[PDB]
Ligand SMILES: O=C(O)CCC(=O)C(=O)O
């Protein structure tokens with residue numbers, strides 16, 4: 070298409086890394102015109118409960134916004150060293166299992182899909198195709214119907230309570246105290262994958278914010294207007310980065326035109342080199358990651374991005390209509 074968004078989506082899909090092509094992409098980790106401050110409520114989440122999600126204390130968090138996009142909040146990586154591996158491990162291993170609908174279910178059964186993890190262990194032994202490599206989305210909580218474009222009181226699997234915990238802290242720190250993680254879409258990217266221009270319009274309550282977690286390889290994110298004519302702003306999303314779309318930003322058109330290969334070759338971003346600590350807190354929502362688990366996760370994220378996206382579908386007591 071020739072309308073501003075599709076033009077730019079096209080440009081960044083076909084962008085060449087390590088050239089002048091990415092000059093206009095904002096990097097929140099490292100421009101100065103558009104990027105602005107954003108206060109987080111620091112006393113909201115305790116130093117102990119941030120510890121339980123694998124997060125730094127909220128006091129340590131950098132948090133930015135954008136000129137022209139009120140309500141858009143961008144953390145950088147808050148996560149403690151190593152703790153990104155638990156969340157990446159859940160998204161591949163636990164969350165994709167059934168119950169809890171993945172994209173492989175349209176043309177396979179519970180027979181074929183049930184040993185996605187064990188198969189990908191077997192790909193470790195075969196040094197020098199797979200189910201994990203075909204996985205593109207998983208839903209949790211209220212399952213989004215891609216065809217109907219609706220949620221339903223019928224189609225739901227209890228939200229993962231550890232992910233619901235991480236969600237609540239991130240929500241509260243951004244000034245969203247009574248946030249209920251009711252619905253989850255997870256997205257899995259190869260280096261050639263893209264997510265098309267869309268608006269996350271089919272939750273019923275548009276007060277409540279949209280949480281967008283990111284892990285592994287970097288991606289470009291286009292955030293645009295209320296209609297697709299308007300040209301978007303490009304920004305990088307790095308491993309561990311978090312994105313709230315709240316207020317005016319909630320119902321904005323956005324996309325991911327590109328996932329990017331590591332600049333220094335193949336291999337992981339530097340932040341993911343640190344492993345999970347052996348000593349984990351007594352009361353934690355994070356669970357020890359085995360040696361084999363880390364190895365599958367590690368080899369996958371060398372050429373993949375995983376995104377988690379946590380939403381509230383119904384107002385605090387808007388029983389399903
Ligand atoms: O992968 C991303 O960061 C985009 C996720 C998203 O917009 C969605 O799934 O609604």
Ligand SMILES: [Mn+2]
Nearest residue numbers: 267268269323
């Ligand atoms: Mn979206």
